[PDB]
């Protein structure tokens, strides 16, 4: 008969979209770790996943934020956020030179390109902080195969009244089209981000909540117009988890090339820890972007939908829904007449409805769902999947 144990065949698959647990820091603004350097206090990015397509837009400036910081006799707006390019061994470095530099390190040579750039950037200690937690974030350019170290950690200065409606340094994180190939990397990004973190958007799929043997719609979502996946991915990046809290003195520090003043600029001396509107379902037909702040725990198979996260690439789409996930797991749980608590499959007979299974019209896998069964869990408010009262004590 039916198992009484609950089972989610999506648990492993869905781990990388649990941004609170896998990333654990701000997405739009990442300033989740504190660091002291020579008795000054800094905030620095700490998320463990990369952010594909993120850069810093400097308003009223055509200069790319990957240009080195502007010090000396130039204005702040003439430069960007990157390390001054004075030393070929520090920043920036091409993949080819990264590979040569660490050719004799076996572990380094096992890293993928992105993790190699992160490890190079994050491994640098400043000669005067050898005991400090401060390590610089990096931007890896996948098109140019180039690793840029960021000299300062600030990501947003849009607040001060001087940033409200031209000759002042105002900037914000964004997924500008110029940034499409860029990867934003804190010091903590996992070397196995490809297995553990979001990257590609999920085609023929929308995020759902697993409720006792079937993937269900997220009831509380916010609808936003979006012309395409890119716009939906940008919208949810603007709404995602954020850690964000005299200009003339700041400009004097840059002119004077003052390390403390530059690196602490635009940071006021809290932490999202990954919580926010991090996920979105994109209706490709109705041109709608449905963002939500609840961790998803499964995917619904829908040919009209693409599932995106704030961390995901702006446009890469993996189209192959895992159609065998239910059938494989039902066979896996049979090894434990004990039939698992899974009421969806592409094999009709593998479920054994007390009635006739219903085909999902937008299922590319031709999934059938058994809705004529006792359900032992439900969705409370704020998208909270809770065990029903009749079984709460029993579980």
């Amino acid at each position: 008969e039916r198992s009484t144990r609950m089972s989610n065949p999506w648990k492993a698959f869905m781990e990388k979209y649990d941004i609170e647990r896998t990333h654990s820091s701000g997405v739009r603004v990442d300033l989740g770790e504190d660091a002291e350097v020579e008795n000054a206090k800094y905030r620095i990015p700490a998320g463990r996943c990369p952010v594909f397509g993120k850069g810093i837009v400097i308003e009223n400036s055509a200069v790319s934020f990957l240009k080195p910081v502007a010090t000396g006799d130039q204005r702040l707006k003439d430069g960007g956020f990157a390390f001054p390019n004075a030393n070929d061994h520090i920043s920036p470095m091409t993949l080819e030179n990264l590979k040569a530099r660490y050719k004799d390190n076996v572990e380094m040579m096992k890293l993928n390109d992105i993790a190699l750039c992160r490890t190079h950037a994050a491994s640098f200690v400043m000669a005067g902080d050898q005991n400090s937690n401060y390590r610089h974030p990096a931007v890896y350019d996948e098109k140019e195969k180039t690793c840029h170290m960021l000299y300062l950690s600030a990501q947003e200065n849009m607040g001060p009244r001087y940033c409200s409606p031209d000759a002042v340094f105002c900037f914000k994180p964004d997924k500008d089209e110029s940034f499409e190939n860029l990867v934003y990397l804190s010091k903590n990004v996992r070397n196995d981000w490809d297995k553990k973190c979001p990257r590609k958007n999920l085609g023929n799929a929308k995020f759902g909540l697993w409720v006792d043997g079937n993937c269900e719609e997220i009831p509380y979502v916010k609808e936003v117009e979006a012309k395409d996946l890119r716009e939906c991915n940008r919208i949810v990046f603007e709404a995602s988890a954020s850690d964000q809290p005299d200009y003339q003195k700041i400009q004097q520090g840059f002119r004077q090339n003052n390390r403390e003043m530059i690196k602490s600029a635009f940071l006021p001396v809290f932490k999202s820890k990954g919580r926010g509107f991090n996920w979105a379902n994109f209706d490709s037909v109705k041109k709608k972007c449905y963002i939500f702040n609840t961790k998803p725990t499964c995917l619904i198979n829908d040919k009209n939908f693409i599932a995106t996260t704030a961390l995901s690439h702006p446009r890469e789409v993996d189209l192959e829904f895992p159609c065998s996930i239910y059938k494989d797991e039902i066979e896996r749980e049979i090894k434990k007449i004990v039939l698992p608590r899974i009421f969806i499959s592409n094999d009709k007979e593998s479920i054994k409805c007390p009635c006739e299974p219903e085909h999902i019209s937008q299922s590319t896998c031709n999934f059938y769902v058994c809705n004529c069964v006792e359900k032992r869990a439900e969705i409370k408010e704020n998208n909270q999947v809770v065990i029903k009262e009749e079984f709460r004590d029993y579980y």
Partner: antibody
Amino acid sequence: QLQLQESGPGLVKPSETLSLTCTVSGGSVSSPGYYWSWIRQPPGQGLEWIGDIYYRGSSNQNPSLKSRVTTSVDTATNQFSLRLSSVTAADTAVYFCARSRGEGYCSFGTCYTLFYYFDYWGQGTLVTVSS
Amino acid sequence: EIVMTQSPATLSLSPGERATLSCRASQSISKTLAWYQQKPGQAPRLLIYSASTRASGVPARFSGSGSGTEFSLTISSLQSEDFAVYYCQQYNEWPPRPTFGGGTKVEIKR
């Protein structure tokens, strides 16, 4: 208002120790990112860096003078000093004290310089080695 | 050590003319290079760091360029007050082991 002042010019006898002090005003020698160094210039000649001192207490020296060079810093009086022992006529020079914008980065057992330039100098003090 | 060689030894030009001063490294030093101007009886004054970053307060007619082993300082329009000895200085290794070039004397024709 940063200004550096070397101690006054004078004589040092051969084989004895040259002693100089630099007095920093309009700023603190306890300033991260900045080292305080000595650079010298024999008459009619070029520039030679001697060594520095950092406010935490560490010091780099020109490897060809290391055995004869001692620097020190007084965080209370905002001064730093130079001691060059066993001087010969080859040490007759104008001695500048200077603020050095310093920044190095180290990974995997090797350090690499980002900045080590001299943005503010004293006036120079002529030291003559003579009997 | 890394040796810095400056060329020419002396430069004689007229006000308003473009002066190009050369500094070569015995060994590749990326862009860890500074330029200084020393007037008679005065201490050197910082012009450029990172090979091309002009220091705060330096007139715009001074500029530097180059990488690796070849470097230049350019005075786009020589002024009569630009008479000085100009020095380059590398600082590539850490712990610092800086060295200077031998200097280029810029004299004004009249």
